């Protein structure tokens, strides 16, 4: 089994940039390399087949090279529609294998979110569970650390987050984070805080239970 | 009815193709030379329909697929590259030549290692 | 352009799934149809291939023991059946026709989810607007759509009258095996005590439709 | 001369003035026979190890024209020749009145009803 | 894997008789049956093949029948040169198997043996073993009780016998019996007797140790 | 019309034996040479076959693990080699050329004896006439041929001049693993001091010939 290593896993670039994705294989694959572009919820589209041959109706800004175990996708002048996930696959010995993917996102300046907090509804709480929601409503980049502090103690393992795709207008993300405690646990404690870090800038939204 | 076209004597004839199977264990180069000797060349796989008889051949045999290290490609005698669609390729140990095995497989093998071979000549 | 696959499947661990793929241009000669899957947290895996013409087939060693490929020459349909399902099998399964140098056509995908969970419609709580969810001219409110299975759920606001300013998050699989998601909307803060906000959660897998009115606290 | 193969059906294998075809469709002996008949031919008759040496290379098991007609008491080829005990190695894997060809000049004894691939032959 | 059963094992007949041997097989052998005649020290000679076909230069007194699992060799008028062992073999599925054989011997009138006893040579005695030999010469039929008595006690385990094939001149048998004692054991006793019984006659030949 | 086999073989339990057979009929086409053995007090057993032309071979399941068949194009020689011998393997081994209907030709056989015993030439004692022994009107005398290995022994009397009334018994295997046999002759009692009786024991396996004069004692 030949393993494919894509590089890097994610890249943040602007329209007009030169972009260079790498695919390194664990064994020689004799130029039987393909490059795919995949937009969310669709099947992979082929760009380059064999190391360097361009597929039909693919714009020529897309170029592939490399030879033995080292292969390269080059996009000379990145265009709006080129933000996507990119994949390499070999077409040599059985089984064919694919790379981990390179996700290409739109670069913009750092942007702190507006943060809102929702305590659990009295309805939900009566049924013996408490969902605290924290909403991060327009930030860049994606990798913002959200921590939950209840009475100043850092909660852990008991939150989950979900993020939107990059906004088409301002290139930002939005994220929701849900802290899940039982009614009993929720009611032991007073101060619920959601604390967002983005390098060395920090936003904290908090509330006190019943107020 | 029709005759099956001009082939060397005592060769298999099928769909405008002549074949022979050789029990003599030879390495790739000597195998090629042998086929050349008979105005032919090593088996080229091209069409699963035209050469469907290859689906029942039992041993491993030399065919005309080789690694050109300059192009870094796998090439047939006439110069064309290997279609990933044509054969299932198994690379169990390394080498620069390939054996044919049954069900349109290709085993990559040491060009030195002597094997049985298949010659093929394309009728007129 | 595409190839026709069977619809989405939800199966329990242990069970089996048979996905079909109707092969568009097959005219009783060599047609290698391949099978690949893609798991949410992954790139793709190649499962196997089968030639429509002769039923010859090859598999990935990883699946060979629990996958089968069958062909129906009359219907031009290939059936990939995967046989000792575990949760890691949850993925999107694609068929593809291999042409001379790459795949000529892909199928549409088939979502296959593998879970111990049983079908359950969502309970829907409000995310109520508060001085601690206002931000000047605007304010944010929403619905927590909690404890459903399988996916999907559909959210709309005020029956689709309220359309822009809405963000429906991706579902999250909880450790209960039940999904959960939030849908939030930003709205004039002046509207808060006057305009009614109702979210319309629809969950076809359980024939449940929930309408929650979200009210300032 | 050196060349040209001896009159065969179109798209059939021609070897030593003999015509063969291998068939992928699983058929029982009678259906197999009928098929070969349909094409002015007959199920594979083995006669010579030298003239039909290519049969040494074909792998799987296939119907040939060797049958026991429960009336005559002995085994026989389609055309009505007897089987020489020299010609094939006969194995009894299952029990029946027909025989499959395998391997190197083997005959596997098979229930005539069980569907298998087949080989037709014409001279 | 087919068993052949021949029947009977042995037959004693006269010149001019009808003989039928049978071969019963454990599975259908589709007439692929051969009959062989084997004289001592020679390779089997084939008589009948495919159950019923007579081989070249085989006299027509030889005839085979049967089908399926039951086959028969018939000799119409048994001739002198036909006394032999007969075998069947199949030529059907691998492995081919043969029968146990039918040994066909000459019937003759009863003939009482001449009985001699030989003491061990002094030479053999000196080397510390003593062979006492008892000879039954030219008798019919084969069955004869030969017993050894040493000082009137019946022997056991001490002796072995060997029989000739039917004599080519008078159709009789000869038998030898050797009693083997160590010199020590031999010298414990005085009277060495061999006793031959044949129907209702018993002859005892004896000697005393040291003449 | 006869095939030629290698001479008699003697081996110990555990060892191997390679018997040859020369075809003389072989003309570079199909020639099935079969191998069959016969134990004393057995019928025959089929061991395997090999085709001279292509070296193709098949064996009896009973021997397949211990037997090899090899062929030589040039000399037309087939070699049957049986390994891991035991005493049950003591038998006469025949090669035969299978013709179109039955076996065309048989070899002359090869004796193979398998025993822990080693070669020994016979020691030969007299069975002396007493003329106290007028039994049938005649007297009997002989030679006891004791403690030899392997078989065979030959007895003749007065160098083959005396054949009438001679009986040479089958060898009997003693529990020592050594064979033993008697040869006897009946002779006029009247001419015992006049006619000389000498037995010629020949034991080729050990290059021993004994010539013993049997005299009255």
**DSSP letter string over chain E?**
---EEEE-SEEEE-TT--EEEEEEESS--TT-EEEEEE-TTS--EEEEETTTEEPTT--TTEEEEEETTEEEEEESS--GGG-SEEEEEE-SSSSPBB---EEEEE----BPPEEEEEPPPHHHHHTTEEEEEEEEEEEBSS--EEEEEETTEEP-SSEEEEEPPPPTTT--EEEEEEEEEEHHHHTT-SEEEEEEEETTEEEEEEEETT-
- DSSP letter at D36 equals H
Three-state secondary structure call for residue F160:
helix
Query: Are the C-beta atoms of D97 and D68 separated by less than 8 Å?
Result: yes
Tell me: cis bond preceding D38? Omega within 30 of 0 counts. Answer: no
In Å, how far is B83's CA from the nearest CA of chain C?
A: 6
A76, containing H or E segment: none
Six token digits for residue C118: 């049983």
Query: Are the C-beta atoms of D67 and D29 separated by less than 8 Å?
Result: yes
User: What radius of gyration, in Å, describes the C-alpha atoms of chain A?
Assistant: 23
Q: Which CATH number fits domain D2-123: 3.90.1200.10, 3.20.20.140, 3.10.100.10, 3.30.450.40?
A: 3.10.100.10
Q: Rounded to the nearest 5°, which phi and psi values hold at C206?
A: -125, 5
Q: Rounded to the nearest 5°, which phi and psi values hold at E196?
A: -105, 125
CA-CA distance, F216 to F188, in Å (whole number)?
Answer: 12
CA-CA distance, A56 to E198, in Å (whole number)?
Answer: 109
**What is the fold of C123-214?**
Immunoglobulin-like (2.60.40)
Please name which of E29, E56, E32, E44 lies closest in space to residue E86, comparing C-alpha atoms. Answer: E44
Domain boundary among E71, E106, E141: E106
- Taking the Cβ of residue C122 and every Cβ of chain A, the question of whether any pair is shorter than 8 Å is answered with no
| Buried residues in A169-187 as b, exposed as e (16+ CB within 10 A) | eebbbbbbbbbbbeeeebe
One domain, residues E10 and E102: yes
F112 beta partners: F9, F91
Query: Are the C-beta atoms of C16 and C31 separated by less than 8 Å?
Result: no
Class of the C4-114 domain?
mainly beta
Q: Who contacts A43 (Cβ-Cβ below 8 Å, separation ≥6)?
A: C2, C94, C106, C107, C108, C109
One domain, residues E127 and E87: no
Q: Do D89 and E68 touch (CB under 8 A)?
A: no
Query: Are the C-beta atoms of A107 and A84 separated by less than 8 Å?
Result: no
A123 beta partners: none
Query: Are the C-beta atoms of E51 and E65 separated by less than 8 Å?
Result: yes
Six token digits for residue A156: 């852990």
One domain, residues A64 and A85: yes
Contacting residues of E for D90, CB less than 8 Å apart: 92-94
Regarding chains F and D, contact by 3 or more CB pairs under 8 A is answered as: yes
Cα angle: C120, vertex C126, C131; to 5 degrees? 160
CA-CA distance, F80 to F19, in Å (whole number)?
Answer: 5
Query: Are the C-beta atoms of B41 and B34 separated by less than 8 Å?
Result: no
Other CB atoms within a 10 A radius of the CB of residue E173 amount to: 23
B61 beta partners: B100, B116
CA distances from A8 to A100, D3, D56, F67 (A): 9, 62, 55, 63
Six token digits for residue D50: 């030298």
Mode of pairing for the β-strands spanning E19-25 and E10-13: unpaired
One domain, residues E70 and E152: no
Contacting residues of E for D99, CB less than 8 Å apart: none
Three-state secondary structure call for residue F56:
coil
Q: Do B3 and D1 touch (CB under 8 A)?
A: no
Regarding chains B and E, contact by 3 or more CB pairs under 8 A is answered as: no
CA distances from F31 to C31, D87, F94, F110 (A): 46, 10, 16, 21
- DSSP letter at C78 equals E
One domain, residues A142 and A56: no
Q: Give the count of domains, chain E.
A: 2
Residue among E67, E68, E91 whose CB faces D85 most closely:
E91
Query: Are the C-beta atoms of F166 and F183 separated by less than 8 Å?
Result: yes
D30, containing H or E segment: helix D29-38
Query: Are the C-beta atoms of E25 and E72 separated by less than 8 Å?
Result: no
| Buried residues in F81-113 as b, exposed as e (16+ CB within 10 A) | ebeebeeebbbbbbbbbbeebbbbbbbebbbbb
| Alpha helices (H) in chain A, listed in sequence order | 122-126, 183-186
Mode of pairing for the β-strands spanning B41-42 and C110-114: unpaired
- DSSP letter at C41 equals T
In Å, how far is E58's CA from the nearest CA of chain D?
A: 21
Question: Max CA-CA distance within chain D?
Answer: 46
Tell me: cis bond preceding A141? Omega within 30 of 0 counts. Answer: yes
Instruction: Let me know how many helices (H) and strands (E) chain D has, helices first.
Output: 1, 9
One domain, residues A31 and A57: yes
Please name which of C151, C136, C107, C76 lies closest in space to residue C5, comparing C-alpha atoms. Answer: C107
CA-CA distance, B31 to A67, in Å (whole number)?
Answer: 30
One domain, residues E95 and E124: no
For B19, counting Cβ atoms within 10 Å of its Cβ (0-12 exposed, 13-18 middle, 19+ buried), the class is buried
Q: Do C146 and A43 touch (CB under 8 A)?
A: no
D31, containing H or E segment: helix D29-38
Residue among D50, D85, D89 whose CB faces F30 most closely:
D50
Tell me: cis bond preceding E75? Omega within 30 of 0 counts. Answer: no
Q: Which residue has the tokens 């009138």?
A: E109
One domain, residues A77 and A124: no
DSSP-assigned states of every residue in C144-204: EEEEEBSS--EEEEGGGTB-TTEEEPPPEE-TTS-EEEEEEEEEESTTTTTS-EEEEEEEG
Query: Are the C-beta atoms of E209 and E119 separated by less than 8 Å?
Result: yes
CA-CA distance, F68 to A190, in Å (whole number)?
Answer: 90
Three-state secondary structure call for residue D55:
helix
Q: Which long-range contacts (CB under 8 A, 24 or more apart) does D5-11 make?
A: D5/B3, D5/B4, D5/B5, D5/B7, D5/B13, D6/B3, D7/B1, D7/B2, D7/B3, D8/B1, D8/B2, D8/B3, D8/B4, D8/D122, D9/B1, D9/D39, D9/D40, D9/D41, D9/D122, D10/B1, D10/B2, D11/B15
CA-CA distance, A183 to D32, in Å (whole number)?
Answer: 75
For A135, counting Cβ atoms within 10 Å of its Cβ (0-12 exposed, 13-18 middle, 19+ buried), the class is buried
Three-state secondary structure call for residue D81:
coil
Query: Are the C-beta atoms of D92 and D111 separated by less than 8 Å?
Result: no
Three-state secondary structure call for residue F89:
helix
CA distances from A50 to A31, A71, A145, B90, C116 (A): 5, 11, 41, 19, 43
Query: Are the C-beta atoms of E43 and F109 separated by less than 8 Å?
Result: yes
One domain, residues A13 and A52: yes
Experimental method: X-ray
- Taking the Cβ of residue F64 and every Cβ of chain D, the question of whether any pair is shorter than 8 Å is answered with no
- Taking the Cβ of residue B91 and every Cβ of chain D, the question of whether any pair is shorter than 8 Å is answered with no
Q: Do F103 and E46 touch (CB under 8 A)?
A: yes
CA-CA distance, B38 to D3, in Å (whole number)?
Answer: 13
F23, containing H or E segment: none
Three-state secondary structure call for residue D80:
coil
- Taking the Cβ of residue C72 and every Cβ of chain B, the question of whether any pair is shorter than 8 Å is answered with no
Residue among D75, D89, D91 whose CB faces E30 most closely:
D75
- Taking the Cβ of residue F98 and every Cβ of chain D, the question of whether any pair is shorter than 8 Å is answered with yes
- DSSP letter at F20 equals E
Query: Are the C-beta atoms of D107 and D51 separated by less than 8 Å?
Result: no
Q: Which residue has the tokens 């059963």?
A: E5
A75 beta partners: A19, A62
CA-CA distance, A65 to B51, in Å (whole number)?
Answer: 35
Please name which of A26, A31, A27 lies closest in space to residue A53, comparing C-alpha atoms. Answer: A31
CA-CA distance, E66 to E23, in Å (whole number)?
Answer: 9
Q: Is A73 left (phi over 0), alpha (psi -120 to 50) or beta?
A: beta
Please name which of F132, F109, F118 lies closest in space to residue F6, comparing C-alpha atoms. Answer: F109
One domain, residues E91 and E39: yes
Other CB atoms within a 10 A radius of the CB of residue B43 amount to: 26
Residue among B73, B88, B90 whose CB faces A30 most closely:
B73
CATH number of the domain within which E56 lies: 2.60.40.10
**CATH superfamily, with its number, for domain B1-124:** Mannose-Binding Protein A, subunit A (3.10.100.10)
Six token digits for residue A60: 């020529």
Q: Which residue has the tokens 């891991």?
A: F84
* Domain enclosing residue E157, as ranges: 114-208
User: What radius of gyration, in Å, describes the C-alpha atoms of chain D?
Assistant: 14
- DSSP letter at F130 equals P
CA distances from A73 to A91, B4, B19, B71, D107 (A): 17, 50, 43, 19, 58
CA-CA distance, E20 to E70, in Å (whole number)?
Answer: 13
Q: Which residue has the tokens 């907090």?
A: A117
Q: Rounded to the nearest 5°, which phi and psi values hold at D19?
A: -115, 135
Q: Which residues of B touch A (CB under 8 A)?
A: 67, 71-74, 81, 84, 88-91, 108
Mode of pairing for the β-strands spanning D116-122 and D42-43: antiparallel
CA-CA distance, B111 to C154, in Å (whole number)?
Answer: 62
Tell me: cis bond preceding A8? Omega within 30 of 0 counts. Answer: yes
One domain, residues E101 and E127: no
Please name which of D123, D46, D26, D27 lies closest in space to residue D90, comparing C-alpha atoms. Answer: D46
- Taking the Cβ of residue E158 and every Cβ of chain F, the question of whether any pair is shorter than 8 Å is answered with no
One domain, residues E95 and E132: no
| Mutation for testing the E interface, residue in D66, D90, D103 having most E CBs under 10 Å | D90
Domain ranges of chain B: 1-124
Q: What is the distance, to the nearest Å, from the Cα of residue C68 to the centroid of all Cα atoms in its chain?
A: 24
- Taking the Cβ of residue F140 and every Cβ of chain E, the question of whether any pair is shorter than 8 Å is answered with yes
Query: Are the C-beta atoms of A78 and A13 separated by less than 8 Å?
Result: yes
3-class SS letters over chain B: CECCCCCCCCCEECCCEEEEEEEEEECHHHHHHHHHHCCCEECCCCCCCCCHHHHHECCCEEEEEEEECCCCEEEECCCCECCCCCCEEECCCCCCEEEEECCCEEEEECCCCCEEEEEEEECC
Mode of pairing for the β-strands spanning F9-11 and F110-114: parallel
In Å, how far is F90's CA from the nearest CA of chain D?
A: 28
Six token digits for residue B65: 């697929």
Q: Do C102 and A176 touch (CB under 8 A)?
A: no
- DSSP letter at F190 equals S
Dihedral over alpha carbons A20, A24, A29, A34 (to 10 degrees): -40
């Amino acid at each position: 089994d030949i393993q494919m290593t894509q590089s890097p896993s994610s890249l943040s670039a602007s329209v007009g940039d030169r972009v260079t994705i790498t695919c390194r294989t664990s064994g020689n694959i004799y130029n039987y390399l393909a490059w795919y572009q995949q937009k969310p919820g669709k099947a992979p589209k082929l760009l380059i087949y064999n190391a360097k041959t361009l597929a039909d109706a693919v714009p020529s800004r897309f170029s592939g090279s490399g030879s033995g175990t080292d292969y390269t996708l080059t996009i000379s002048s990145l265009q709006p529609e080129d933000f996507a996930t990119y994949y390499c696959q070999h077409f040599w010995s059985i089984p064919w294998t694919f790379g981990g993917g390179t996700k290409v996102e739109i670069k913009r300046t750092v942007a702190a979110p507006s943060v809102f907090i929702f305590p659990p509804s009295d309805e939900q709480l009566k049924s013996g569970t408490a969902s605290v929601v924290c909403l991060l409503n327009n930030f860049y980049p994606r990798e913002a650390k959200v921590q939950w502090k209840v009475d100043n103690a850092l909660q852990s393992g008991n939150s989950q987050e979900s993020v939107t795709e990059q906004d088409s207008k301002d290139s930002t993300y939005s994220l929701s984070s849900t802290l899940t405690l039982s009614k009993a646990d929720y009611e032991k404690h007073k101060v619920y805080a959601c604390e967002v870090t983005q390098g060395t800038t920090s936003v904290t939204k908090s509330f006190n239970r019943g107020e | 009815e029709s005759y099956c076209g001009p082939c060397p004597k005592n060769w298999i004839c099928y769909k405008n193709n002549c074949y022979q199977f050789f029990d003599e264990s030879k390495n790739w180069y000597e195998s090629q030379a042998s086929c050349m000797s008979q105005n032919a060349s090593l088996l080229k796989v091209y069409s699963k329909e035209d050469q469907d008889l290859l689906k029942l051949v039992k041993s491993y045999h030399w065919m005309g697929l080789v690694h050109i290290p300059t192009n870094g490609s796998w090439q047939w005698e006439d110069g064309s590259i290997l279609s990933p669609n044509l054969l299932t390729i198994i690379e169990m140990q390394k080498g620069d030549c390939a054996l044919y095995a049954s069900s349109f497989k290709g085993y990559i093998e040491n060009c030195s290692t002597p094997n049985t071979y298949i010659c093929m000549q394309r009728t007129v | 352009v595409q190839l026709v696959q069977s619809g989405a499947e939800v199966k329990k661990p242990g069970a089996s799934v048979k996905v079909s793929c109707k092969a568009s241009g097959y005219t009783f000669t060599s047609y290698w149809m391949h099978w690949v899957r893609q798991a949410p947290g992954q790139g793709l895996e190649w499962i196997g291939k089968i030639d429509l013409s002769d039923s010859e087939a090859h598999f990935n060693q990883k699946f060979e023991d629990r996958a089968t490929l069958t062909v129906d020459r009359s219907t031009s349909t290939v059936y990939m059946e995967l046989s000792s399902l575990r949760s890691e099998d949850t993925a999107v399964y694609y068929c593809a026709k291999m042409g001379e140098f790459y795949f000529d056509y892909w199928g549409q995908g088939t979502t296959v989810t593998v879970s111990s969970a049983s079908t359950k419609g969502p309970s829907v709580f409000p995310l109520a607007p508060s001085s601690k969810s206002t931000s000047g001219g605007t304010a944010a409110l929403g619905c927590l759509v909690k404890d459903y299975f399988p996916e999907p759920v559909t959210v709309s606001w005020n029956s689709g009258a309220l359309t822009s300013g809405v963000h429906t998050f991706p579902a999250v699989l909880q450790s209960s095996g039940l999904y959960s998601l939030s849908s939030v909307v930003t709205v004039p803060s002046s509207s808060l005590g006057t305009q009614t906000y109702i979210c319309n959660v629809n969950h076809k897998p359980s024939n449940t439709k929930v309408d929650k009115k979200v009210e300032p606290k």
